[PDB]
Design a protein around this ligand. Sequence first.
Ligand SMILES: *[C@@H]1O[C@H](CO)[C@@H](O)[C@H](O)[C@H]1NC(C)=O
Ligand SMILES: *[C@@H]1O[C@H](CO)[C@@H](O)[C@H](O)[C@H]1NC(C)=O
Ligand SMILES: *[C@@H]1O[C@H](CO)[C@@H](O)[C@H](O)[C@H]1NC(C)=O
Ligand SMILES: *[C@@H]1O[C@H](CO)[C@@H](O)[C@H](O)[C@H]1NC(C)=O
Ligand SMILES: *[C@@H]1O[C@H](CO)[C@@H](O)[C@H](O)[C@H]1NC(C)=O
Ligand SMILES: [Cl-]
Ligand SMILES: [Zn+2]
Lengths: 597, 194
Amino acid sequence: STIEEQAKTFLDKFNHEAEDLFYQSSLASWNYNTNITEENVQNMNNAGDKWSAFLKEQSTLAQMYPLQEIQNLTVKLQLQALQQNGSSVLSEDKSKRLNTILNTMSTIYSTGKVCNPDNPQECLLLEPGLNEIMANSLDYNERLWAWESWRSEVGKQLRPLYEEYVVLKNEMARANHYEDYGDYWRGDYEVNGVDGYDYSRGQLIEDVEHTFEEIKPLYEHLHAYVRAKLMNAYPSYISPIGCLPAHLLGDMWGRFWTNLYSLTVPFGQKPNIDVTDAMVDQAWDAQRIFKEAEKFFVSVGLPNMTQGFWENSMLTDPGNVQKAVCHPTAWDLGKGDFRILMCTKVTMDDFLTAHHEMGHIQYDMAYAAQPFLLRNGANEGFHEAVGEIMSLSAATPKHLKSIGLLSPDFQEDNETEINFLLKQALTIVGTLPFTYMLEKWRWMVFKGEIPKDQWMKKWWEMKREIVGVVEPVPHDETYCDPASLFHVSNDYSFIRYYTRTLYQFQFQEALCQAAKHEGPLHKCDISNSTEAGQKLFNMLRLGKSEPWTLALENVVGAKNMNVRPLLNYFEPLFTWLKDQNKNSFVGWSTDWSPYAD
Amino acid sequence: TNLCPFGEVFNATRFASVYAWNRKRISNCVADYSVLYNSASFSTFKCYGVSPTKLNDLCFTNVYADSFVIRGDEVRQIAPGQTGKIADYNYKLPDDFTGCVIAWNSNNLDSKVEGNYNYLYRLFRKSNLKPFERDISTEIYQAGSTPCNGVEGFNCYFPLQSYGFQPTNGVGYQPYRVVVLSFELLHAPATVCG
Ligand SMILES: *[C@@H]1O[C@H](CO)[C@@H](O)[C@H](O)[C@H]1NC(C)=O
Ligand SMILES: *[C@@H]1O[C@H](CO)[C@@H](O)[C@H](O)[C@H]1NC(C)=O
Ligand SMILES: *[C@@H]1O[C@H](CO)[C@@H](O)[C@H](O)[C@H]1NC(C)=O
Ligand SMILES: *[C@@H]1O[C@H](CO)[C@@H](O)[C@H](O)[C@H]1NC(C)=O
Ligand SMILES: *[C@@H]1O[C@H](CO)[C@@H](O)[C@H](O)[C@H]1NC(C)=O
Ligand SMILES: [Cl-]
Ligand SMILES: [Zn+2]
């Protein structure tokens, strides 16, 4: 009788049909990524739009149940996840303009290419050409060319598309009774209707600013040391007090700083830990890499990969006849089908990525008992953080000794510890100002706190002051530099990376203290720690059936994103940098320019 | 003193749908269940009321072997006193149950590429099923009170859904052929015995 039971019956039918339609979608897309044939891309597209038309029809049917008269917040979260009609709440004229805008932007990204003025014939796509250029060049000018030319040839095409796109996204958002599209996005972090654990869509903005406040000291110290090394590598192109140029950050935008290790390594003669040769010498194969990742997970208390994972996974690149996209990827096809697609090499890096993807698989296995609509990360940042902590605690020298892969006479020391930690900080800390600043610019643009006539003017300001990075060339209002990045021009929200980084070190410190680990947080190896296993699984098993604040409290005993565990993890490196910085300026002044001479 | 065709009951070409769950009435035979127990080819063999060891020479009037295919995850619902879709709306086991549940994976027979959709389970019902009652009804389940007049639409559904049984399914989503035995009690002579 009651409307509650109408919603219940509706979801009970939707789940049992959406399951199989999504499974067909998934098998078709898998068979594609495994064996690229035009037969297969066609089967893929067919099943894809079948399931998409189904969920549009179901969204229509679902909006016939007002959110008012429902109390069960499980039922209400499912009805809300479905009822979110999206572009279908627009007039089909406007939805058409929207989707041609979106596809035009995606293709201007993917098919974009930059050409040298010396030769109108030969020129380069982004990956691998320009990505490898920016990742490996030690030359100032050629990196500058890759950077500025990719921004001036692909971004300027996306600028007006991005303006029209933000207009129609704001209208689609205000037509869904959100305030803006940025608000639509932060709706991923909203909790309503649970006393004490709720969260509003501006509380996220203030929380992220607050945690970034405490991260500013560590990042300033690391930024100062990295600037010191980079000037001992780029004598005339970096100032001791100014900000870091954007093209010299190891890739096209500066998102991660990994590629600066060979320039910032503290002990440039003490060796890294690179254990590929120990896998070579002992007849380790892909089966061995993944058997060791599986065993590392059973050590902590999580179950092992199921037989279907062994049968159906593409674990090695399968020859020259059949083609496949070798992006390491974990697959939940639904219906109990968990697989991995990864062209495995015999390398330390792939050895670790095995643990990462297996952690993705373990998160997927954890919440697969939830209702279909609630089979996801507790919020948009939990999956990848769960994946990353396993890579951490599997790259530990004591872990490499416990598995016969390093000699017990290996000497851990100040040298190896500061090496590992500075590499880690290049990858993990150098991305937090970037991620925070990008999503802040996007939010401010969707809310309208930046008129389009000042779009770029605000971008490169939030760079100079939040990330300590300056653009190497003046960028007027025709660029849309933000969209030269994938996630912007491809309509993906970004703050997942900030929240994920912070959550991963919160989880890490929590699981390490549950491990009774003594000594610095980096040496922590949660293997053989069933306590870390229970503490991680108590959050894993939830999915988005609970407010992400509650699940976060299930692991870290705090109700909200916190940055004390991250600073704790980087404490040894923190004080080493403080010793290295005695007679150098920590912090940057946002006035110096690469191009104002 | 002949043998009851236990093979076909376990070996039939394609099984029946759980909503119209097939029933065999096994009578007047010799039946040593020892081989079925220790066949070690069944992934689940749970006897409720008397353990599989002794039932070889406890003497029954007449036994029913219900058979169907469900998902693996659903096998637990075939247990006296459970809840869920398969337990409430397709096949309900009474808590005073006596016979056993014999589930074995059939990812190779009952599943096939592109999915084997021949099996159906009833997803909705205006009331729970009684023990052992079979509902084959096909009348559009009315979620509200707005009449539907025998055609699907909004708030009215077809109460029969199909399993999609591919061979790449997980062990819980894999077609599990389930044979349930419930033994009877009567003062008429016990005829299934030995
Ligand atoms: C690869 O694709 C062809 C045609 O698309 C198909 O017939 C073949 O079975 C595929 N390979 C495998 C191993 O399935
Ligand atoms: C919400 O619904 C689920 C399944 O529909 C049920 O198990 C749960 O008890 C309900 N919550 C409340 C508070 O009744
Ligand atoms: C995982 O380990 C348990 C331990 O007995 C074992 O029973 C199970 O079969 C293992 N998983 C697989 C896929 O074999
Ligand atoms: C985990 O425990 C096993 C049990 O013998 C041991 O062999 C292994 O070295 C331990 N590894 C770690 C990292 O504690
Ligand atoms: C089903 O057939 C196999 C194949 O011979 C046989 O071993 C088995 O006993 C049969 N099932 C039953 C219940 O007898
Ligand atoms: Cl940029
Ligand atoms: Zn990942």
